[PDB]
Symmetry: D3
Subunit: 323 residues, 6 copies
């Protein structure tokens, strides 16, 4: 053990001037994310399925064309389900694997298992194809600046498999891929040759995106040790609207209202939270109206709400890394 | 498993025109329940006592008289208590036992054990005698409609024994009939012959009443995955207000105030929720003034409030079931 | 509790003069069991298969034909397997169901699941078809005596489903019917009406047969608190030797060699022993040569050895029960 | 068992009148607490450390100077931790240990471990040095009236050690002293000689103080089985204001506000609540802004808020003990 | 932590010359142990009973007349049983409580709960009134030498309450008093002010006596880390017979045969063994023939076998302490 | 699943003839093992220590020099312990990692921690430095024949770290490296791409070596599901004797004796056995006399016994792999 694992407790942003912001809002394109990153993911992709194989190649192919030095890992594993043993694969994308600290962004890339009702197919556009597509567009839009990284801190993406339950949500029939990965990281020394610190120690903060893409969302501030970065979010939303860099957005319908909760949700942050990781959980209260219906689909997304959030997220990340 | 367990997530009411609502308002009577269903329950009936056996006979012989083909089971079992071993009996009443799905209403029929204090005896008017009687009046007013049932969905009622702690509320000393019954349904194939599904799968939704009977209640919405049905309950209160069918009512004091909660309450629903069954928990917050005191008696109930909620619950059930 | 649960510790045989022993030696026949009770069981009968259902019908219709008032129950339930959910059925046969105490004989009626290897199919002649048939011949030879029963003690038989592991022997994948049934009796009052005692209390002693059918077995004494009854079994072998009633026998190769063991074997008795019930475990050590191989077939059984042990077990039971 | 464990259910306060209230409000001194109880506790005081030992001395000394006949016990124990095995010591201070019923005030007296960041030290002013000094000041201010104790009910204080986690919060890295002490009282008979009642049964109400000192706190009503006593704190606050005995205080921003909370906090009360003890939990929501930073120091505390809260707590305690 | 807790691993006896032995064999009187120490203990003494109270006073009164500086403690506690919560009391007798290391001798002083069959009463003469009486006679016979203790080592006796089960032997209905005391000692620092070592560390070896008093007993050598002192036992038995200091004792019926086991027994050593304490378990294989019968009584003890063992035990203890 | 996990059930050896046996018996050298594999491992080598690191280097180096194409992996992980958190490293050495089936030889390469007593150091000669050198010598002696591997079945070696307990043996203070590695293989799919089979499924037989080196060992047959392979070791021993290829060896005192054992030993095999892997456990009963003392050193080892056992093990391994 040493002292660097407490650095995250004292870390401060580098906020951007109003000329800089302008640039960022101009650096991202909702319509190319729609075409190149999202539409290929709107397919039946439950664990084990052919579409699961397909979504996984798409993701790596998109990261591989970028210019920054990304390092991809495929973490494959076996577990028991209500239908038997099945195989699962998490996807992990890391700049600077050697660095001690990383900021982490994540979502889940599987879609719930369903029968073909009404000759229809479930594809989970908010749940969570869009958040996947948001993580990809961000890495494209900031690619040039991200090269800069050749504070011992950098960035990592995680796309989890097996979040949804197969049959009945339970402590054993849900969260396959994140219950797996959190335990593996708690048992891996980090950095190499370390005697007392694991890879979980290295996670500054986990920002988890889920159920995004519907008009008029409202996000709670969930956690006391993440409260100060939720506030940074509120402020970024505000200066942007004050310069009219957002569309179809009123200050009385803000996304980031400072209002609490208490009654937590089960999601891929629970394995890591139970082990002490600070979490910023970007999920709305309440859930889109189509949650887990065949109508959670492409024609029910609001182009504008998605577009506004890409801008807020991209700013936060740059601010956190001092880029 | 199979495909039918899904249907409950696609399920939608068949809502009532306002004419219908009129018929049903006048089709139940508060004065007949009060004396034929409730007064027989206002007695000492902790598990094992002679009140327990009497209460049990009364419940079953009221159900057995109606025209609909109700099928009764008694589920008797033994558990360890802080006073040593004792005997417990749950009550289950089912229409179309063989149908694959059932909407379920339920409450607890025991009363908590106290010593006689100043020659007063604890009867639990609110906790939960009124929920029992409300359930019994329901099966009467709708007997004619329910009879039709001969979408493979039907109705079921549960009266749990042993909700209350014998000495100190704890995991080991509370919720005796519910913990037992939830593990029993978990292990029982359903429907007969099945090879991969259980009776708990067949539970479309669980409505639990508890601590109903005092005036001015406020009912939080507790759980997201049941929230569409909590909304319905709000519609029903509203309109019936407009149609002048409630009494001593003020939209100031509406029972269903959408606001979110938690939560966070320990009750008979726990062992079922744990295993993946949707729940609709109708217990007020705050509790009544007289909770677990000797004044929880008959003279402290507001006749107008129960009359009102019998109307709301009766409608919900036809609407959920399409009659 | 009460006082009757003690009686089993004070209980003593009523031993048989040698005349009696003669009558009983000639009162059973090995050739009638072999063809009327055994051959119908030599088939593939892993849980869920069609063999399982057939085996089950055969067992019940053999019992149902005899003069003694046997009462049959089928105990059907659902469990999680490494192949997903499946259906299981235990068989229980009881004389004087209401008597407070019962001596219990038992074995497992399923066969282990294998793939067809060189067009051979696994039938488990020793494991445990012969124990089933031995149990069935018993209830025949003594039908006349058992009839007398109308000391509140009587007899019961159990045939467990699901003893064998589906894929890899482990706590979660083995002993499915026994784990389920032991928890069920643990929770059921006995006798009816009781307030402090259970069906497991009523279990005077549990005799489990398994892996019987090859020649030269050796039966360790496993448990102290059943050792007085293991001794009785040694008397019975000895004398019957002296009286020239066994066959192809050598006191060199006596089956019951007093020496101590452990132990240490996982089998259907575990969930019952765990909760305080005396056990008499008649499984050989070492196992047969052909254990879990395809040669565990009919042609490898020694007719003389089973004839011998049917004699020993039949006597024990009259002696334990006083007929 | 006996009947006395029911008394706490029916117990009622003896409300003070207006002449009394001004007496109490003038009887406490904020500057004496500040300089003589509080400043000595603003030191590094994590478990095992010299500051831990100084603090313990300080709390013991100050109680020893008082007239009332407090019985002091140090409850020292041993426990595994993420840094290996360690010794902890709870502080217990009892009037009339023989009395069967006690009202309990509690807090935690350790401070969280941190490395020194840029020459700063964590001293946990709100967390929970202020709560410690409020308990010492109330003992001084009420001393003469406490003498009256010699309704068999007295008062008791607990300073817990090891509340905080060494590395990352979990069930086995936190609440060291309160897990230990709860489980011991549960296994200790009270009053002496009893055969079926424990010391936990004699806890009338556990009032835990935590995270106190910042301006504008708001306290939720956490628990339905203490709600009537929360109500008493609101009435107390309101009448003290109306008499003009509070400083810098607005009825629009009051401390005890009748709003509930769904999703609770882990704290020293869990182990006693899990075993059925009634809790009044005096921790605010939201947490102070300075929570778990080096800025939770002396200069960020609000004098007037703490003096107001002292006066309310003192009144509450006298009315409980009919003094 | 330090180094003295490993001393027990290197500790060697001080063996006695053949003049010394003679003395010891002359120093003990079976007939006064029979009259003064044993006969008062042959009474109904189940937990809670009047005879439990009586046996407990007898024991302390006997220790209090001796001349060495014994320190008595009564450890009273509460636990749940099949019949409810009951109170229990262990008895502890210690020379030199401050010393770091102690040799420990123990047995249980409760007798099993039974109905009065045949107007008869169970008193457990082997189980374990005799071993109690043996521990007392030893302290009398060596009293003078024991004073010598005013290596930091000395001696301690423990008489456990609640060994037997009330209703059905189980992990929760057996071993009350030793499951309790072992956990308490693991959590107590020893010696005072210690940071890393508990009272369990201080136990060199626990010698546990149970079921003694019947002719022709045979004791296994159970444990590899106690094997070397079991051998000392064998040797003491041998030299004594070679000098004819024993009665009715043949070298072909020795008590201490070097022969193994493996299949452990459940008894009061399990709580301490599971936590690493070295155990020498003086229980025979097999159990007396009267085990748990009304015939386990005074007229079935063999005066001579008991007398021989007092001599072997007394020698071992003196040899271990170098006295 | 697939069918191959059944192969190990039907697999049969290819017995060597007499010309072959003399070749093997002459092909191994005890003096080369002694000076080049064994003496370097007689050092303090507890986890975390410099000797731990030297040992690891030594084992890796020696395998690296050999022709066959061993694939080496260091499996380093992190784990809580009685002295805090720590880093451990297992050593794994595989031929043909792709093959689906492997035969596994194993031992532990750490030494127990002790303080120095009178200038002596614990080096664990039998426990388990000798077993480590036997595994290195067999690799040398069979190298040329192992080349033949390129029936899809190869060979694998495991040196476990952290077998021993730091303070006192328990489920959470022992078997650090083998708990870790079992659970990982169970969650890893094999062969690559599989959807329902793990690496554990490919363990044909795990042969664990422990506590080897003393004169006159006797090994029990511990496990019925490996008994046919134990039988092969007896036949091997017997024919090697008859050919006069063993040294100082009597058929009256032979190593593999057909006697069973009831009550097993906790060792590195438990975690694989608990998940259904077949085990041949080569540990003797009784344990060596020098067990866990400073006398388990070089001078107390028996050369001829170890050379005999090498020859038997080498034969056994070739016959498994039809080499
Ligand atoms: C009762 O069964 C449950 C159902 C839902 C929850 S839950 O807490 O609301 N889980 C939501 C997480 C999620 C779903 N799709 C994407 N993310 C929890 C339990
Ligand atoms: C401290 O022990 C506890 C006591 C109460 C709760 S509780 O959450 O408030 N549940 C009470 C449910 C109930 C009582 N009577 C009818 N329904 C929780 C814990
Ligand atoms: C490694 O997995 C294990 C396999 C077997 C045992 S076992 O103890 O040998 N039990 C087998 C019982 C049985 C098998 N067929 C009929 N009865 C124990 C563990
Ligand atoms: C099956 O129920 C059981 C019965 C006995 C055992 S046991 O292992 O044999 N316990 C013996 C301990 C004892 C009894 N009286 C004095 N000491 C274990 C379990
Ligand atoms: C407390 O003392 C104990 C004695 C024996 C056992 S044990 O069960 O026999 N297993 C330890 C085996 C071993 C030790 N070193 C190498 N192998 C465990 C604990
Ligand atoms: Zn979802
Ligand atoms: Zn209640
Ligand atoms: Zn089998
Ligand atoms: Zn804190
Ligand atoms: Zn006993
Ligand atoms: Zn060892």
């Amino acid at each position: 053990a040493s002292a660097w694992p407490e650095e995250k407790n004292y870390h401060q942003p580098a906020i951007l001037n109003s000329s800089a912001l302008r640039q960022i809002a101009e650096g991202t394109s909702i319509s190319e994310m729609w075409q190149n990153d999202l539409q290929p993911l709107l397919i039946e992709r439950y664990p084990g399925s052919p579409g699961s194989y397909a979504a996984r190649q798409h993701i790596m192919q998109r990261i591989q064309r970028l210019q920054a030095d990304w390092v991809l890992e495929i973490d494959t594993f076996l577990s028991q389900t209500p239908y038997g043993y099945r195989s699962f694969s998490n996807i992990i994308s890391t700049l600077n694997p050697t660095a001690k600290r990383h900021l982490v962004l994540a979502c889940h890339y599987d879609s719930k298992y369903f029968s073909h009702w009404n000759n229809r197919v479930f594809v989970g556009a908010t749940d969570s194809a869009v958040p996947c597509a948001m993580m990809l567009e961000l890495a494209r839009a900031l690619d040039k600046k991200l090269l800069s990284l050749k504070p011992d801190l950098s960035l990592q993406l995680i796309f989890f498999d097996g979040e949804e339950a197969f049959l009945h949500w339970s402590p054993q029939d849900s969260l396959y891929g994140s219950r797996h990965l959190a335990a593996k990281m708690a048992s891996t020394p980090h950095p190499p040759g370390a005697r007392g610190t694991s890879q979980l120690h290295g996670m500054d903060l986990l920002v988890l995106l889920d159920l995004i893409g519907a008009p008029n969302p409202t996000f709670p501030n969930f956690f006391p040790n993440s409260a100060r970065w939720f506030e940074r979010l509120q402020a970024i939303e505000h200066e942007l609207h004050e310069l009219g860099l957002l569309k179809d957005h009123s200050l009385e319908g803000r996304y980031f209202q400072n209002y609490s909760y208490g009654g937590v949700i089960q999601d891929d942050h629970i394995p890591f939270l139970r082990r002490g990781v600070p979490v910023l959980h970007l999920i709305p209260s309440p859930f889109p109206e189509v949650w887990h219906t065949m109508d959670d689909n492409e024609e029910n997304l609001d182009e504008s709400t998605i577009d506004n959030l890409n801008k807020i997220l991209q700013v936060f990340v740059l601010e956190y890394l001092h880029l």
